Amino acid sequence: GKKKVCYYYDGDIGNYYYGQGHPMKPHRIRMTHNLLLNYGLYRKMEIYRPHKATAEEMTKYHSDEYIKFLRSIRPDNMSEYSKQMQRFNVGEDCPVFDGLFEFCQLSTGGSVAGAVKLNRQQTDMAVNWAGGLHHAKKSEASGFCYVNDIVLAILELLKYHQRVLYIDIDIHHGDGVEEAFYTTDRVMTVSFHKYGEYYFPGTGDLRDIGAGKGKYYAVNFPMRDGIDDESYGQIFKPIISKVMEMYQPSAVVLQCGADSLSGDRLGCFNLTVKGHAKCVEVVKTFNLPLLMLGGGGYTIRNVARCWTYETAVALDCEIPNELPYNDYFEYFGPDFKLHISPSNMTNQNTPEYMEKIKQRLFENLRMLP
Ligand SMILES: CSc1ccccc1C(=O)NCCCC[C@H](NC(=O)c1cncs1)c1ncc(-c2ccc3ccccc3c2)[nH]1
Ligand SMILES: [Ca+2]
Ligand SMILES: [Ca+2]
Ligand SMILES: [Zn+2]
């Protein structure tokens, strides 16, 4: 029926600045919080402030060398660590900024706290919008991510769950999560993303299905520019339903990257908030312990709308399209509405392409015991 939702948020998260012109804007999490608070969602869920994850917690997946570098690097001592910066991919994409390590601790802290809270059966859904940083590697930062909170949270769930299902609806391929569990059947990583012609991160081919004991436990749905609600909607439920039937998981982690929305400054997809939220509703019908994370998103007004609505969906709460007054009301102009309209962009994904990729995916799903 209606489930218990635990929400994680640190009031300071919005103060971390990546640098002038960088598209990663932590302020989008404070806009999200302010919007869902202003709609009255605080009355229906538990709000918790996440702890600052320790180097011990982070090293359950990451190397000590990489975590020690992260916990010591600063804009002032930058010149000293020139070699280490290159080794760990800290530079233009993943800059060195004031409070970098603290930001990682808060982002991670909520994901691991949600996994613990779910493990103890104290909640049915845990939400951490500051998490979902799917590109971070064992000893390397990548695509604005430094610590892979998702991998750490999955490692936490694996303590009480034999099989965990990871679903990634960000526009980019969830490389870091896929790589972490590429050779195990204990975690199945299913990712829907845009693919081809030097599009970040370069990975996510349909033919990438896992290795060793993890062969057939890595699923990838490569899409082209312009995918709409209708096209995405016809593939998501059938793939997820088959993955549930064959894989039979006991816990689910769903990364909700909003960079797959219409008009995103870094994305080329054309989903609306109702189309994006349809994925949360689909996953929610299986009534399995669920951890909901954030991820991509540069058009911060659309990110705030999307995650406010997906929190409402998780609560089975109907909220009006008319936006309530809030601390960032001017960002949502000139409509001041919660829902967004799709653009006139061409959907390169022909329905036949969608059905062909889906067919090949189901072939691979037949290979599970
Ligand atoms: C959407 S924000 C997000 C939030 C949470 C989790 C994930 C994401 C995400 O999708 N991250 C990946 C985004 C793509 C990275 C992509 N980079 C590359 O392709 C390569 C880099 N090095 C070699 S190739 C990129 N797209 C735009 C820029 C960019 C633009 C302006 C900048 C101005 C200042 C400084 C840096 C900047 C980086 N970089
Ligand atoms: Ca994805
Ligand atoms: Ca796997
Ligand atoms: Zn992304």
Swiss-Prot record:
The modification N6-acetyllysine is found at residues 68, 215. The keyword Hydrolase applies. Coiled coil: none annotated. This is Histone deacetylase 2. S-nitrosylated by GAPDH. In neurons, S-nitrosylation at Cys-256 and Cys-268 does not affect enzyme activity, but induces HDAC2 release from chromatin. This in turn increases acetylation of histones surrounding neurotrophin-dependent gene promoters and promotes their transcription. In embryonic cortical neurons, S-Nitrosylation regulates dendritic growth and branching. There is a cross-link at residue 68 (Glycyl lysine isopeptide (Lys-Gly) (interchain with G-Cter in SUMO2)). Residues 2-316 are annotated as: Histone deacetylase. Its EC number is 3.5.1.98, 3.5.1.-. It comes from the Eukaryota. It is found in: Nucleus; Cytoplasm. Zn(2+) binds at residues 170, 172, 259. Keywords: Acetylation, Biological rhythms, Chromatin regulator, Cytoplasm, Hydrolase, Isopeptide bond, Nucleus, Phosphoprotein, Repressor, S-nitrosylation, Transcription, Transcription regulation, Ubl conjugation. The modification S-nitrosocysteine is found at residues 256, 268. It comes from Homo sapiens (Human). The active site is at residue 135. Histone deacetylase that catalyzes the deacetylation of lysine residues on the N-terminal part of the core histones (H2A, H2B, H3 and H4). Histone deacetylation gives a tag for epigenetic repression and plays an important role in transcriptional regulation, cell cycle progression and developmental events. Histone deacetylases act via the formation of large multiprotein complexes. Forms transcriptional repressor complexes by associating with MAD, SIN3, YY1 and N-COR. The chain holds residues 8 to 375 of 488 of the full protein. It catalyses: N(6)-acetyl-L-lysyl-[histone] + H2O = L-lysyl-[histone] + acetate; N(6)-acetyl-L-lysyl-[protein] + H2O = L-lysyl-[protein] + acetate; N(6)-(2E)-butenoyl-L-lysyl-[protein] + H2O = (2E)-2-butenoate + L-lysyl-[protein]; N(6)-(2-hydroxyisobutanoyl)-L-lysyl-[protein] + H2O = 2-hydroxy-2-methylpropanoate + L-lysyl-[protein].
